[PDB]
Amino acid sequence: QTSCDQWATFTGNGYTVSNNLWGASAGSGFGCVTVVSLSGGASWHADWQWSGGQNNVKSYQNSQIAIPQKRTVNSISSMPTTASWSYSGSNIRANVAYDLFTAANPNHVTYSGDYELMIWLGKYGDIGPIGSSQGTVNVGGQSWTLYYGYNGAMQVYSFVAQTNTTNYSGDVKNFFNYLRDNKGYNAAGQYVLSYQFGTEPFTGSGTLNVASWTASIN
């Protein structure tokens, strides 16, 4: 189904698609999500138009999976995911990105974390991640520009693809392992609180078509 309501959510089979227009107060416009299928992953599209607040994210329309029991990053053996998407519209300033929070407390509120891991498969316009570039890194055989900085007390690592990656197959465990093995990230003590995929728009008119998104934690 389709909804443009600010906080619309749709759930099925452990997947949830949310409108999540948390930054609407930064501009004029709208955001709508359409669920096509929640069987065999999430197939959905995000539609939006935004003006004003040049450097303010307006929303993070996203699909995510339920995480009934929080586990440490090291205890998890695999976090496989696939994504097939395309972006259309005009004057698109927006990204396409995975978002995950972790925290030392497994009972941490799930709307923030000690750390935020982002994996930007797409980047439209002159926008950029939190922090500064730490250079090019290899994860899963693909090159990423890794950014690191703080959003308040929370530390944010964003792996940004060097080309829009519209068909992706990977394992988020490889990204956490990169941090654990190269940036002192405490995978032994951090629990995965969320596992999301969507788009952060700033301005323009856009449609993100997510033909398929799958993710699980094993």
Ligand X SMILES: *[C@@H]1O[C@H](CO)[C@@H](O)[C@H](O)[C@H]1NC(C)=O
Annotated catalytic residue, options 127, 196, 200, 202: 200
User: Per rule CB under 6 A, is residue 161 in the interface with ligand X?
Assistant: yes
DSSP code, position 190: P
**93 scored as a contact of ligand X (CB under 6 A):** no
Task: Report the amino acid identity of residue 56.
Answer: N
Report d(CA 37, CA 30) in Å as an integer.
23
- Tell me the residue type at 140: G
| Minimum distance, C-beta of residue 204 to ligand X, in the bound complex (Å) | 11
Pick one of 50, 98, 124, 168: the residue that binds ligand X (CB under 6 A).
Answer: 124
200 is catalytic: yes
Residue whose CB is less far from ligand X, 16 or 145: 145
Tokens of 114: 């000690």
Cβ at position 136, least distance to ligand X in Å = 13
Looking at 72, 112, 164, 177, which residue binds ligand X (CB under 6 A)? 164
Name the burial class of residue 119, with classes exposed (0-12), middle (13-18) and buried (19+) by CB atoms within 10 angstroms of its CB.
buried
Q: What minimum distance in Å lies between the beta carbon of 197 and ligand X?
A: 16
Q: Considering the complex, state which of residue 106 and residue 125 has its C-beta at the smaller distance from ligand X.
A: 125
- DSSP H or E segment with residue 47: strand 42-51
Question: Among 182, 189, 159, which residue's Cα sits nearest to residue 171?
Answer: 159
116 is annotated as an active-site residue: yes
Between 125 and 189, CB nearer to ligand X: 125
Query: Is the dihedral angle over the CA atoms 131, 208, 15, 17 positive or is it negative?
Result: positive
Q: Kindly list the distances between the CA atom of residue 33 and the CA atoms of 7, 11, 104, 119, 158, in Å, as whole numbers in the listed order.
A: 10, 12, 33, 21, 25
Stretch that binds ligand X, among 6-14, 74-82, 119-127, 174-182 (CB under 6 A): 119-127
Q: Does 101 bind ligand X (CB under 6 A)?
A: no
Q: Is 123 in the site for ligand X (CB under 6 A)?
A: yes
In the list 6, 56, 163, 167, the residue contacting ligand X (rule: CB under 6 A) is 163
Spatial contact of 144 and 136, defined as CB atoms under 8 Å apart:
yes
DSSP state of 24: G
Residue closer to ligand X (CB basis): 102 or 199: 199
Residue closer to ligand X, measured from CB, 20 or 165: 165
Q: Which of 44, 62, 116, 168 is catalytic?
A: 116
Contact yes or no for 45/10 (Cβ under 8 A) = no
Residues that bind ligand X (CB under 6 A): 122-124, 161, 163-164
Positions marked active-site: 116, 200
